[PDB]
Amino acid sequence: IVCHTTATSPISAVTCPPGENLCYRKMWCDAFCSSRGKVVELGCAATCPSKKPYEEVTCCSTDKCNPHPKQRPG
Amino acid sequence: WRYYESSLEPYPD
């Protein structure tokens, strides 16, 4: 499948190799929950591991399923 | 580095 990543410079989406089928989106307010806040992470994953009350990650089983919460539509 | 919810730009640390 294909998931969205935020490791590179800009945000893009690739096809996870023969290992990961699910995507993930991490969120946690960076010391600016008022201004900046919830840090947005992007990446692929095979399964949905645990998650702390703060640094949580939403895993899904679909393509381009882990887009930025405030990503521009189009 | 990653991005914050307040924007879509890259954010280093």
Short mmCIF file of C-alpha atoms in Angstrom, two decimals:
data_model
loop_
_atom_site.label_atom_id
_atom_site.label_comp_id
_atom_site.label_asym_id
_atom_site.label_seq_id
_atom_site.Cartn_x
_atom_site.Cartn_y
_atom_site.Cartn_z
CA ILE A 1 0.00 0.00 0.00
CA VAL A 2 0.92 3.68 0.07
CA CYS A 3 1.22 5.87 3.16
CA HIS A 4 2.13 9.47 3.94
CA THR A 5 5.54 10.30 5.40
CA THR A 6 7.00 13.37 7.07
CA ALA A 7 10.62 12.21 7.45
CA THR A 8 11.85 13.87 4.26
CA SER A 9 12.00 17.64 3.79
CA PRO A 10 8.45 18.07 2.40
CA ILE A 11 5.61 15.67 3.11
CA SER A 12 4.98 12.91 0.58
CA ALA A 13 3.67 9.36 0.26
CA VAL A 14 5.39 6.17 -0.88
CA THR A 15 4.68 2.46 -1.14
CA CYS A 16 5.65 0.50 1.97
CA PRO A 17 7.95 -2.46 1.12
CA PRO A 18 6.96 -6.13 1.74
CA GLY A 19 6.67 -5.53 5.47
CA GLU A 20 4.27 -2.70 6.27
CA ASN A 21 0.66 -2.48 5.15
CA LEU A 22 -0.69 0.06 7.63
CA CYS A 23 0.03 3.76 8.08
CA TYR A 24 0.52 5.89 11.20
CA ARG A 25 -0.07 9.48 12.30
CA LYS A 26 1.45 10.72 15.56
CA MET A 27 0.08 13.69 17.48
CA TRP A 28 1.18 15.48 20.65
CA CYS A 29 1.17 19.19 21.49
CA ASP A 30 4.68 20.53 21.22
CA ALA A 31 5.33 23.16 23.90
CA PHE A 32 2.83 25.40 22.14
CA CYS A 33 -0.51 23.48 22.21
CA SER A 34 -2.00 26.99 22.05
CA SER A 35 -0.03 28.08 18.97
CA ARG A 36 1.99 25.17 17.55
CA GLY A 37 0.76 22.26 19.65
CA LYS A 38 0.07 18.76 18.44
CA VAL A 39 3.16 17.70 16.57
CA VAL A 40 2.23 15.79 13.43
CA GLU A 41 4.23 12.72 12.44
CA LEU A 42 3.79 10.47 9.40
CA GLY A 43 4.98 6.99 8.52
CA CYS A 44 4.11 3.41 7.58
CA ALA A 45 3.77 0.42 9.90
CA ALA A 46 2.90 -3.28 9.85
CA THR A 47 0.74 -3.14 12.98
CA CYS A 48 -0.61 -0.70 15.57
CA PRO A 49 1.73 -0.83 18.62
CA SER A 50 1.02 0.66 22.04
CA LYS A 51 0.83 4.41 22.68
CA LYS A 52 1.31 6.80 25.60
CA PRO A 53 -1.47 9.20 26.73
CA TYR A 54 0.66 11.99 25.25
CA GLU A 55 2.65 10.67 22.30
CA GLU A 56 -0.18 8.81 20.57
CA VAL A 57 -0.20 7.37 17.06
CA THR A 58 -3.26 6.56 14.96
CA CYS A 59 -2.72 3.55 12.72
CA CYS A 60 -5.00 2.75 9.78
CA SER A 61 -5.32 -0.03 7.19
CA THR A 62 -5.84 2.00 4.01
CA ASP A 63 -3.94 4.01 1.41
CA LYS A 64 -3.20 7.70 2.07
CA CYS A 65 -5.09 7.13 5.33
CA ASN A 66 -2.59 9.01 7.50
CA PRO A 67 -2.76 12.59 6.11
CA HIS A 68 -2.03 15.76 8.08
CA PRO A 69 -5.00 16.75 10.31
CA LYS A 70 -4.73 20.21 8.75
CA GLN A 71 -3.43 19.16 5.33
CA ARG A 72 -4.66 21.26 2.41
CA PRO A 73 -7.34 19.43 0.33
CA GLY A 74 -7.19 18.98 -3.43
CA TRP B 1 12.41 16.72 12.21
CA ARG B 2 8.63 16.73 11.77
CA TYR B 3 5.65 19.03 11.34
CA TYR B 4 3.30 20.65 13.83
CA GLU B 5 -0.50 20.65 13.64
CA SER B 6 -0.52 24.44 13.41
CA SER B 7 1.09 24.18 9.96
CA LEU B 8 2.24 21.92 7.13
CA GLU B 9 5.85 23.14 7.00
CA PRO B 10 8.91 21.16 8.23
CA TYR B 11 10.00 21.69 11.82
CA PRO B 12 13.50 20.64 12.99
CA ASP B 13 14.66 20.16 16.59
#
